[PDB]
Each structure stands twice: as C-alpha cells, then as structure tokens.
Amino acid sequence: DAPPLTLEGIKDRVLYVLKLYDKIDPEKLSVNSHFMKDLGLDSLDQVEIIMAMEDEFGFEIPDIDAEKLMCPQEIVDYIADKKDVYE
Template sequence: MSELKDTIVGLLLKIAPEADAAEIKPNVDLRDQLDIDSMDHLNFVIAMAKQFGLEIPEKDYPRLTTLDDCVAYVQSRGT
C-alpha cells in the first residue's frame, strides 16, 4: 500500500518537480495542491497508465483527483 503510494508520488514529482513529496496531502485535489494544469494532469495519468499497465478511459480521470483516489483506483483495477 505505502509502496504503491510512494510509486505514485514518484510519478507526481516527475510532473511537478517543484513539489515537496512530504507535503502532498493524500485527500486534497492534486491539481489544486500541486498547482498543475490539465496538461500536467494528463501527463500524470499517462505515467500512471504506463507504470501500472492500465488503459485509463477519459471518463475515469475524475477518479484520479487525489492521491488516495489514485491508490484506490490502481487497487480497484487489480494491480
């Protein structure tokens, strides 16, 4: 679980290198707290898809809003 979370944080830091891993709050909208735009978020979703070998449809983007969301999403997709 925490390994999964760390992996996702690692992906986030590639998208938002200015962010501080220790300060990412698990239940706050990532776009708001990291101040990233829709293009960054898409880059993040692409990175998630590659990392976990998932096909993530556009309608699922809202399920990747917070760090906790992302962890739950990957788990629900059976990785």
C-alpha cells in the same frame, strides 16, 4: 507471473512517481492533496500525470474515469480497485 502487491506498495510507488515530477515540490506533498486546487498544476499536465501512471503500471484507465481522479488518494484507490489488491 508471480508479483506480490499490497496497499503499501501501490501507495508508496504512486507517491514516488508523483514526487519525481518536475514542476511540483516534495516539500508540501501529502497523500491527500488535490492537483488543480492546491498544488496548482494545469489539467493538461494532469493528463500527463495520468499518462505517467498508465505507462508505469502497464494498463490503460479510460477517459470516462480520467476526468475525475485529481488526487493521489483516489489514484491509489482506483488502481487498487482495478488490480484487486488483496489476499
């Protein structure tokens, strides 16, 4: 396996596959926005979001973490921590 990865790629891909989801909108979607607080989607769908990132990037994140992501900046940060995305 030879993939290259950077912070730009993981940021754009996570924001991409959150932009594609149905019951939110790409009009008001910053990098820094909560899920329950201002986008206003329920926690059930928040775990569906976590399921989407797990099924995309190809590795489980535990429910000891999946309580408390809630915002795409910390999602990008946590998966960049797990894959150790630097050279």
